[PDB]
Amino acid sequence: GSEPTFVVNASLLPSKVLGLQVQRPQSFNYQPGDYLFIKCPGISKFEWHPFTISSAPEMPDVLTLHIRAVGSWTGKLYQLIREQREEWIRSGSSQSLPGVPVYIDGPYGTPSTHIFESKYAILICAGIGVTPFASILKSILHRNQQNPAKMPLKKVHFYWLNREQKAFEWFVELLSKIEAEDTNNLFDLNLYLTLITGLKSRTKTGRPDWEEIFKDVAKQHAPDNVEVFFCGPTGLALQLRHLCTKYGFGYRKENF
Ligand SMILES: Cc1cc2nc3c(=O)[nH]c(=O)nc-3n(C[C@H](O)[C@H](O)[C@H](O)COP(=O)(O)OP(=O)(O)OC[C@H]3O[C@@H](n4cnc5c(N)ncnc54)[C@H](O)[C@@H]3O)c2cc1C
Ligand SMILES: O=C1c2ccccc2-c2cc(N3CCC4(CC3)OCCO4)nc3cccc1c23
């Protein structure tokens, strides 16, 4: 529930995305995949919008939100931060940067968190739909550095689709640190534009062949259970749903 706090820093990222840092209340506990609702009196004192927490709960003093300017309230928040930041680089640090006051209500849970309790997982996301998976991947890293035993998760298949290639930069560092530190090959990273990421990962092109991919994973893990988690558009969800029934994978209806 409800608690006053501050956007203390922000990040202006490609495809009109704000990388908000928010002072984490001293009593605020979340799980990776959790989201919250946020109110910004400066934009509207009546409106609450939900955003996935892109930070891992192991990061101790701030929450992260990655928000795309897509309409009225996000457009305005973007403009307010662009202008607050351009004005403080023209004026300068006359005094410490003033932090945008906000209300947060949460955390709210999503079935994505069940990944920490699966053996074999498929994560599929498009554009800003990466954000819950961003939180989950960072958490998995803190969790090997501290207790690889307590992890029943044996393989993670990651598919991230984007129409613009500069959107992969939102999380290119995280993807490096995994590429670097995944000596035991827990992860299978796949980036599609719908090698090129300057990653050891070959950025692929076109709509992926989801039948071919689901078949492949089935053969890797059968007869054990694979879980699918999807954050993206419904047309895709619908194709993925049929495919989960075909190859016997777990599906959650989160797309309507
Ligand atoms: C659990 C959850 C997590 C989320 N996490 C994130 C996240 O991490 N990052 C993120 O960026 N977003 C996230 N979202 C989306 C976010 O919550 C915002 O409310 C929404 O993305 C933007 O609100 P807005 O006022 O800016 O846009 P709106 O003005 O509501 O417009 C939104 C969309 O509707 C279109 N539109 C506008 N008017 C009409 C109309 N009359 N008819 C049809 N279409 C119209 C716009 O072009 C745009 O595509 C999440 C949502 C949920 C439910
Ligand atoms: O978990 C969700 C979610 C769950 C149930 C219903 C909707 C969402 C969800 C929607 C969403 N949108 C809709 C697609 C978008 C970006 C913002 O780009 C085109 C217009 O707005 N963006 C999201 C980004 C991250 C996570 C989610 C979402």
Automatic annotation (TrEMBL):
Residue ranges of every copy of the FAD-binding FR-type domain listed in the record: 3-114
Keyword NAD set for record: no
Single GO BP term: defense response
Major location (coarse): membrane
Annotated FAD binding sites: H49, P50, T52, H66, R68, S72, W73, T74, T131
GO molecular function: calcium ion binding; nucleotide binding; superoxide-generating NAD(P)H oxidase activity
NADP is among the record's keywords: yes
Annotated GO CC locations: NADPH oxidase complex
Subcellular locations according to the entry: Membrane
Protein name: Putative ferric reductase
Lineage: Bacteria, Bacillati, Cyanobacteriota, Cyanophyceae, Nostocales
